[PDB]
Every structure is written in C-alpha cells, then in structure tokens.
C-alpha cells in the first residue's frame, strides 16, 4: 500500500541550529532523492541513493547530509541552518517501469531559516459580513476573512460553517500580498471569500467561523520579547447568520 | 541540461486550446512532463523516449522532436481542473542515473467562463466593532483586469473565482482594504 511522505510541511527556525527532513516511501523503491528549489529558480538535485549504503551529492556545494540505511528512509540533515538554506524542500524515490524511471514525490518542507527570530508574527483573523447591497440585489451573501500580520507565508486558511469545513463557494487568494514591499521581510496579508445564498446567511442558527492555522515558534524556541510568543497557532474570526 | 519552458505564465478561459513548450541545447535519452498543484509533490502526467513521437492522454498531447531537444505539451479543450505548474524534466543517460534536469515550468490557470456578470464594488463590515471595512468588487466577466494597488497604503488582491456548485453558478472576486483614512470603496478598484 500507501505512498511517499514527508515531514515537517512548514519549519521556521532560528540560524545555527540542526534540521532533518524526513522522508519515508512504502513502495520499496531502491532510488530516493532530494531536491531543492528557492524562490527564483528550478528543482534541482541535492543528494540521491541507489539504495541502502549509497549516498550520492546531485550538488557539490550543498551542506546538507543524508543517510540511507534502510530503503524506506531517507533523511536529510543540516547541521547548521543560516538563512541561505530558507527554500523547498522535495523528496521522491522512482523505480523502472517500462524501461523508464518514473518519480513519485513528497508534497515538501517549506523551510525558513531566520537570523532574527523576532521578525516572528501570528496572523490576525477579521471576518468582514455580507454587505446587505450585496444580498438585496444579488440573492447572495459574501464573507470576506482577513488573515494579516503574519510572517513567514507558513498558513492554511479554511472556513467552517456549523463546525464542518466547506470548500464550496470559496476562493483563498493563491498567493499572499506584502504589507510593506519594501522589505524582503515585509509582513504578509490573506484573504478568502465564502458565497453563501443570502437566506442561508440570514438564518441566525449559522455560525461561519475563518480559521488560520499558523506554523511558528516551537514551546523549546528562545523567547525574550515584550509581546507573546509566536508559536504555531491557530487564529480564528467568526460571525452569525443575521436576518436583517 | 539548461531546460526552458514557455510561456513563464498562461492564463486562459476554459473550452480553448493551447500549446507548452519545454526546450534545451542538450539532446535527451527521454524526457517527462509533471503537473504540480500548490502545496503537493510533482505528479508524472508521461514519459517520452523517441525522437518525433505523439502521446495522447486524454486531451493532452505530448511530442518529443526529432531530434530529442524539446517536447511540447498541447490541451484541448482546457478546463478551470488544467489549473498548475506544468513542469517539462529531460534525462541525459550521459550524465548518471536518475539524473533529471527540471524546467521551472508553465504556470498555467483556466477561467470558468462567467453567465451572467453583474459588476459592482460593495462594502463589508467587521463582524466585530471595528472602524475597519473591506471593499470586495464582485461579479465581473474573465476579461475585466483588477488592476494592482501601486498606492503604499492600499492593498488590492488579484481575481479569484468561486464556484456555488448547489447553483451552478461561479463569481469573481477582487478584494481591497486600507488602514484608513482618505481610503474610499469608491476609489479603490478605478482604472
């Protein structure tokens, strides 16, 4: 059965610290590998096994390790994180199937390595309600979630009506906007839409709550800031359906 | 071994057809086509190995050139469902095993096309006391471009498509927002 998984998703750590990556397949695949891609450019190769015993640099200037000891592993160590290594992070393995090679991939680690833990931010969550120009003239309800604030882009914004999520009539903005542009540090903003017909929205029963799930600080992380620690956290805003 | 691919980026309504281009100076013993969704690993849409050959997987065709430098990926009929990096991946056996060389691909989004369109730019309230408000332009056809801020102090989000599937009924949206104080949901989606 099963696939190819990698952990953590998201990781913002402070610089000098040790990382590894994980990386596990269940298809007893004998080649694994890790690729890597920054902002600008294309996946490139960083390390790959043949197998249990071999470990191969794709990249000769990485100062990343792995290790290979059982053909379900593959690990990826950085002995000591600097900002440089801020990046994405994909494991695959492959086998031959008709003659070819084919890969199957991890869905990633997005890494952020910061020299300065205090650029560390939640996002704040505002649920805006339908505006009623909307609802008279179109027969439907718009809420619109502000998630803002928040730095690095580690995220998942998801909307939850009468406790269960929905993903019909809702679009999350693709990409987050930059609060301050210039700075490369700039904090970041989300938004998301839920459409609802407006008498599903005027029914008082209905609760809507936007929730984001930010990934921070660990409990372990150093912390001396006149202001609460930016750990992973979950924000919400939430409103009620209102006739009206 | 330097992998191209083109166009950077492809925004298109869905029912048309387009075609992809992936390019290298270096010749390839095969080569492979990955689609990869926000948030997710690469998936492997095919493999091509002989100079000039045509795959058809489903309403997408993928050719190799002859002499095994480019391949080009075509869609017929694209739906809003093609959405995603298109990545273009070369194998030189002359280099080592397992060796591919990535593209860094064609961002490829598909527009639902809109019904009825019904422009307007409305206000939204905080939900709890606040001075703050959003203004949300919604209900525009697939060519009104939302143009970007420019302005510091207003943040202006791009297009964004929604789909009430009980309805069958889809909008556009474009989100705008400032701090205060001159900031109007007058001016903020003007052109």
């Known amino acids: 059965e099963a696939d190819i998984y990698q952990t953590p998703r998201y990781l913002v750590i402070g610089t000098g610290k040790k990382i590894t990556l994980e990386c596990s397949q269940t298809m007893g695949h004998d080649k694994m590998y890790w690729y890597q891609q920054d902002p600008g450019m294309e996946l490139h190769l960083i390390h790959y096994?043949?197998?249990?015993?071999?470990?191969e640099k794709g990249d000769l200037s990485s100062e990343s390790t792995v290790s290979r000891i059982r053909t379900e592993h593959f690990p990826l160590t950085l002995e000591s994180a600097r900002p440089s290594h801020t990046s994405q992070y994909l494991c695959?393995?492959?086998?031959?199937?008709?003659?070819?090679?084919?890969?199957?991939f991890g869905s990633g680690t997005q890494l952020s390595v910061l020299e300065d833990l205090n650029k560390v931010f939640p996002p704040e969550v505002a649920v805006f309600e339908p505006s009623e120009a909307e609802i008279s003239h179109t027969q439907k309800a718009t809420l619109v979630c502000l998630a803002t604030g928040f730095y690095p882009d580690h995220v998942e914004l998801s909307w939850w009506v009468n406790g269960k999520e929905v993903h019909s009539g809702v679009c999350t903005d693709p990409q987050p906007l930059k609060e301050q542009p210039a700075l490369n540090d700039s904090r970041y903003a989300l938004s998301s839409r839920l459409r609802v017909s407006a008498t599903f929205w005027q029914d008082p029963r209905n609760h809507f709550r936007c929730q984001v799930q930010f990934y921070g600080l660990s409990e372990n992380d150093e912390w001396t800031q006149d202001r609460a620690k930016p750990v992973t956290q979950i924000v919400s805003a939430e409103a009620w359906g209102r006739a009206d | 071994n330097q992998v191209e691919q083109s166009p950077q980026f492809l925004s298109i309504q869905e029912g048309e057809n387009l075609t992809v281009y992936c390019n290298s100076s270096?010749?390839?013993?095969?080569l492979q086509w990955y689609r990869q969704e926000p948030g997710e690993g690469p998936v492997l849409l095919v493999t091509?190995?002989?100079?000039?050959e045509v795959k058809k997987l489903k309403r997408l065709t993928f050719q190799f050139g002859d002499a095994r430098k480019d391949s080009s990926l075509h869609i017929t009929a694209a739906q809003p469902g093609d959405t995603g990096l298109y990545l273009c991946?070369?194998?030189?056996?002359?280099?080592?095993?397992?060796?591919?060389?990535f593209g860094r691909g064609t961002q490829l989004t598909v527009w639902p096309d809109i019904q009825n369109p019904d422009p307007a730019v409305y206000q939204l309230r905080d939900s709890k006391s606040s001075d703050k408000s959003v203004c949300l332009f919604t209900d525009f056809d697939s060519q009104t471009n939302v143009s970007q801020s420019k302005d510091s102090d207003v943040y202006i989000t791009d297009k964004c498509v929604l789909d009430m599937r009980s309805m069958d009924f889809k909008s556009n949206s474009a989100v705008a927002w400032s701090n205060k104080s001159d900031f109007a949901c007058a001016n903020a989606f003007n052109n």
């Open positions: 096994s043949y197998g249990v015993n071999s470990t």
């Open positions: 270096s010749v390839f013993s095969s």
């Open positions: 091509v190995v002989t100079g000039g």
């Open positions: 991946a070369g194998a030189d056996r002359g280099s080592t095993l397992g060796r591919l060389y």
């Open positions: 695959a393995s492959s086998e031959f199937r008709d003659g070819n090679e084919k890969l199957f």
